[PDB]
Design a binder for this molecule. Structure first.
Ligand SMILES: *CCC(=O)N1CCC([C@@H]2CCNc3c(C(N)=O)c(-c4ccc(Oc5ccccc5)cc4)nn32)CC1
Length: 267
């Protein structure tokens, strides 16, 4: 179908790194168009389910969401072909101190992500693992949301529940940690943590705690605190994502309006 790219149309040009599914490469499609190619190592993914979901993902389209161009599934490893983001993952970009970011730039990164998440929310599509490591940066410095929904297809159980040793505890609200209750409001919580990561220039959330200690901190009702670079108004926005009661957390539409208000007031 239209979700299938012919891998013969790819020219591989550069290694981009490795993650839990294996290697990612940069190349060209039909000699002209920049693409990234994520190669899914055998045994790592629930492949038939992912392939079916890729059809849904191809219909998503937003300027701040990494575009899925297609998949290559006639051979193994299968390929995911996407828009190319030359500046890599947001986490590592934030940690490069040479950039000497202004706080207006940091707030713009938050706004980029919030726009993508408002779009996903309008499509009833949960990210399920939003974090700076899962956002990408293009050659213009624009941040886009990536790997959306992908955690649903991971076969390594260390990633798939809080009983696992590689679960995103530090991005999880109390109802996820205690009950596995995912919702729009668990994406909201994670977005607040992501804002904290941005304003902390890529520090690990709860940097001095283990995952187990973090879950206890959350069970006691405690929270991250204000990054040095966040104004009081910015801190209010990120902190609003962490209400104990999920229903008291904002929507992405509300967060976007709040971010724009602050951008105007701090311009
Ligand atoms: C900090 C995290 C980290 O070290 N890595 C994750 C990003 C990896 C590289 C970096 C360079 N660019 C890039 C791209 C890209 N599109 O340019 C990708 C990538 C990410 C996701 C997908 O496939 C999907 C997209 C959207 C939804 C579902 C799947 C393809 C390609 N990865 N990188 C380096 C390591």
């Amino acid at each position: 179908g239209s979700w299938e790219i012919d891998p013969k149309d790819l020219t591989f040009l550069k290694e981009l790194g490795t993650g839990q599914f294996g290697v990612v490469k940069y190349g060209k499609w039909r000699g002209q168009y920049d693409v990234a190619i994520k190669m899914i190592k055998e045994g790592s993914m629930s492949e038939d389910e992912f392939i079916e979901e890729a059809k849904v993902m191809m219909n998503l389209s937003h300027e701040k969401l990494v575009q899925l161009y297609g998949v290559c599934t006639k051979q193994r490893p299968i390929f995911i072909i996407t828009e190319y983001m030359a500046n890599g993952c947001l986490l590592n970009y934030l940690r490069e101190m040479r950039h000497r970011f202004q706080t207006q730039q940091l707030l713009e990164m938050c706004k980029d992500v919030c726009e993508a998440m408002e779009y996903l929310e309008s499509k009833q599509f949960l990210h399920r693992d939003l974090a700076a490591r899962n956002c990408l940066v293009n050659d213009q410095g624009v941040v886009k949301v990536s790997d959306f929904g992908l955690s649903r297809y991971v076969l390594d159980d260390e990633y798939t529940s809080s009983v696992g040793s590689k679960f995103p505890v530090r991005w999880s609200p109390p109802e996820v940690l205690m009950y596995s209750k995912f919702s729009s409001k668990s994406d909201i919580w994670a977005f607040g943590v992501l804002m904290w990561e941005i304003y902390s220039l890529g520090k690990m959330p709860y940097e001095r705690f283990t995952n187990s200690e973090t879950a206890e901190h959350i069970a006691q009702g405690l929270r991250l605190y204000r990054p040095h670079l966040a104004s009081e108004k910015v801190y209010t926005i990120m902190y609003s994502c962490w209400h104990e009661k999920a229903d008291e957390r904002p929507t992405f539409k509300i967060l976007l309006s709040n971010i724009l208000d602050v951008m105007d007031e701090e311009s």
